[PDB]
Design a protein around this ligand. Structure first.
Ligand SMILES: Cn1c[n+](CC(=O)c2ccc(O)c(C(N)=O)c2)c2nc(N)[nH]c(=O)c21
Ligand SMILES: [Cl-]
Ligand SMILES: [Cl-]
Ligand SMILES: [Cl-]
Length: 162
């Protein structure tokens, strides 16, 4: 496995290769990130939430998440959205990120982006996108305001009961 944002990721299918790529934020800052290229499925296991994730290169395809309560589930969603490396997440950075503060000098850009959205995920959630759901029994959608919905959800994301 490996650990990212307090979650243990275990690949269950697929594969990927690593390459450095530049990306532009919503404030048109250029970040150099390690992009993982390939379709992969993962289990994400945290202390307070768990998820199954399917992703492709820079794209979240499916995230089904369960957890203790809304705060834990939200945190898993944020980690998954940042781990996806999706453009709408990079573009949700609307101000400059600080890479000079001594406390930030040992964060790689992936970790700078995680810390940014951990502080406040509102813009992330507001710009990710919603879709209609044909709600499956035992699951529910989740809206950008982190409230449940039987009718709509963040794109690709569903909440399961524990
Ligand atoms: C988007 N992303 C980030 N990682 C790798 C990652 O976050 C990490 C974390 C801790 C680690 O110790 C290592 C390591 N030493 O290999 C890697 C990823 N790994 C894969 N396979 N796919 C991804 O999309 C991905
Ligand atoms: Cl990086
Ligand atoms: Cl791909
Ligand atoms: Cl696809």
């Amino acid at each position: 496995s490996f650990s990212f944002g307090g979650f243990t990721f275990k690949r269950t299918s697929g594969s990927s290769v690593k390459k450095e790529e530049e990306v532009l934020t919503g404030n048109l800052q250029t970040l150099k990130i390690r992009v993982h290229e390939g379709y992969e499925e993962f289990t994400m296991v945290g202390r307070r939430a768990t998820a199954i994730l399917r992703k492709a290169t820079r794209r979240l395809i499916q995230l089904i998440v369960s957890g203790r309560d809304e705060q834990s589930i939200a945190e898993a969603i944020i980690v998954a959205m940042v781990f996806s490396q999706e453009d709408c997440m990079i573009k949700a950075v609307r101000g400059d990120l600080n890479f000079v503060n001594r406390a930030n000098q040992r964060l790689n850009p992936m970790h700078q982006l995680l810390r940014h959205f951990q502080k406040d995920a509102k813009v992330l959630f507001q710009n990710w996108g919603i879709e209609p759901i044909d709600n499956v029994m035992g699951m529910i959608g989740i809206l950008p305001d982190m409230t449940p919905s039987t009718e709509m959800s963040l794109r690709g994301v569903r909440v399961s009961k524990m």
